[PDB]
A and B are shown apart, each in its own frame.
Chain A
Amino acid sequence: STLQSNMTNEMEQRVEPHNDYFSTQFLLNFAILGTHNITVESSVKDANGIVWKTGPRTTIFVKSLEDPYSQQIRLQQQQ
C-alpha cells in the first residue's frame, strides 16, 4: 500500500493453485487517513523453487476516511 497517490502494508501469501485457480484473503490496515494505492503483484514459484515475477502488478485506489461516528465524537470531545 502506497499513500498519497509508501509501502505501508507489506504482506505475502504463497498459495497453491489447484485447477489453475487460486484464491486468498488479505487484511489491509488503513489507520492513517487519506488516499491509499493498493498494489498486488503476482509471482510464480516453479516446481524447482525458482521465483518468477510473471503476473500483473494490478493496482486499485482506496479512499480511507474517518467514520461519521468517530469524527462526531472526537469533535464534540474537543469542542
Chain B
Amino acid sequence: SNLALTVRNGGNVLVPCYPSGVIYDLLECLYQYIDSAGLSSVPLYFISPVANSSLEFSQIFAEWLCHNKQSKVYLPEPPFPHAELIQTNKLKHY
C-alpha cells in the first residue's frame, strides 16, 4: 500500500533487500496487487550482480517447495510467478 501510494504521486520507491530472501514473497504480492491497483505501467527494477542467478535458482528449485507449489511440476509450468512478470516485461532485472 505504501509503495502504491508513493508511485501514484509520481515518486520513486527504493526497497533495500537481499537478492534471494523475502524479495520473492513481496514480489508475488506485488504482482497480485498492481493488477487491481492499476499500476502495471510502472517498472519493477531488480539490480544486483546475482539477479538473474537468483531468479533462475529460485525457479529451478521446484522440488524444494510445499505440496501446493511443487504440484506445478506435473503440468509444464515454472513454480514462481515472477517468470510471468518477466514475460509480460513487468519485472526487469539488471
Residues of A bordering B, CB below 8 Å: 73, 76-77
Tell me which residues across on chain A come within 8 A of B9, comparing CB atoms.
77
Give the interface SS of chain B, mostly helix, strand, loop or mixed. loop
**Interface residues of A: mostly helix, strand, loop or mixed?**
helix
B interface residues with partner A (beta carbon < 8 Å) = 9-11
Nearest residue in A to B9 (C-beta to C-beta)?
A77
List the 5 shortest-distance A-B pairs measured between CB atoms, nearest first.
A77-B9, A73-B10, A77-B10, A76-B10, A77-B11
Residues of B within 8 A of A73 (CB): 10
CB distance from A66 to the nearest CB of B (A): 15
Bound CA–CA A76/B10 (angstroms): 9
Bound CA–CA A73/B9 (angstroms): 9
CB distance from B2 to the nearest CB of A (A): 16
Q: How far is the CA of A76 from the CA of B9 in the complex (A)?
A: 8
List, in ascending order, chain B residues with CB within 8 A of A77's CB.
Answer: 9-11
In the complex, what residue of chain B is closest to A72 when comparing beta carbons? B10
Question: CA of A73 to CA of B11 in the docked complex: distance in angstroms?
Answer: 9
A-B contact pairs, 5 of them (CB 8 A): A73-B10, A76-B10, A77-B9, A77-B10, A77-B11
